[PDB]
Structure 1
Amino acid sequence: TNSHGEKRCTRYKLQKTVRERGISPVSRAIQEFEEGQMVHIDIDPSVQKGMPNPKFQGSTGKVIGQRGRSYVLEVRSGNAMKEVFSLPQHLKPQKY
């Protein structure tokens, strides 16, 4: 029957394009975000640690704090506000 794992229906969500497979650019892992900054969640499949749920892939979160290397984001999911923890490898600043 059909399962209920985290990696449910993640074949293309957690896949890389052909010419971006391998070691990702390391600059994305050492980016810093200020409190209240809006960042996109674009999960890097090669970085298997600190990865939020794929359900939050494609969402913009607001940075509300830091929990070590990872950032705490307030991410809207339907009508709820979820606290999502993410390494900066999966994050990306919003550009205005």
Structure 2
Amino acid sequence: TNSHGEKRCTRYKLQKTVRERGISPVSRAIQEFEEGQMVHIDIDPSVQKGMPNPKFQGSTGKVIGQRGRSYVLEVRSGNAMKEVFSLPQHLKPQKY
């Protein structure tokens, strides 16, 4: 039977491209975010700590608070609001 683990069916959700494999840009890991700012969840597979679910990969979260290094995001999953803790390595700002 199939499993129910957190990494289930994440062969390409949590995979890095060939020319971004290895160390990531360190400037992405100290990008400070403001209160209420909209940020995109684009999970960095190399950074194995503070990662959200693969189910939130590609969702825009509204920053509502900080819990140390990571940020608190109000993410939408279908019809429910979720609080998704993610470090700045996995987040990316939305530009207008």
Question: Aligning the two structures, in what range does the TM-score lie when normalised by the shorter sequence?
Answer: over 0.9
Structure with the bigger percentage of helix: 1
**Corresponding residue SS for 2:40:** strand
User: Structure 1 residue 52: deviation in Å?
Assistant: 0.2
User: Structure 1 residue 23: deviation in Å?
Assistant: 0.4
Runs of 4+ in structure 1 off by over 4 angstroms are none
User: Structure 1 residue 37: deviation in Å?
Assistant: 0.1
**Corresponding residue SS for 1:46:** coil
Using the size of structure 2 for normalisation, the TM-score is: 0.99
Provide the rounded CA distance (Å) in 2 between the counterparts of 1:30 and 1:95: 18
Provide the rounded CA distance (Å) in 2 between the counterparts of 1:28 and 1:60: 17
Unmatched segments (≥5 aa) in structure 1: none
Provide the rounded CA distance (Å) in 1 between the counterparts of 2:85 and 2:27: 19
Using the size of structure 1 for normalisation, the TM-score is: 0.99
User: Structure 1 residue 80: deviation in Å?
Assistant: 0.3
Provide the rounded CA distance (Å) in 2 between the counterparts of 1:12 and 1:79: 25
* Cross-structure match for 1:25: 25
User: Structure 1 residue 64: deviation in Å?
Assistant: 0.3
Unmatched segments (≥5 aa) in structure 2: none
Percent of aligned pairs with the same residue? 100
CA distances 1:18-68 after superposition (whole Å, capped 9, x unpaired) = 000000000000000000000000000000000000000000000000000
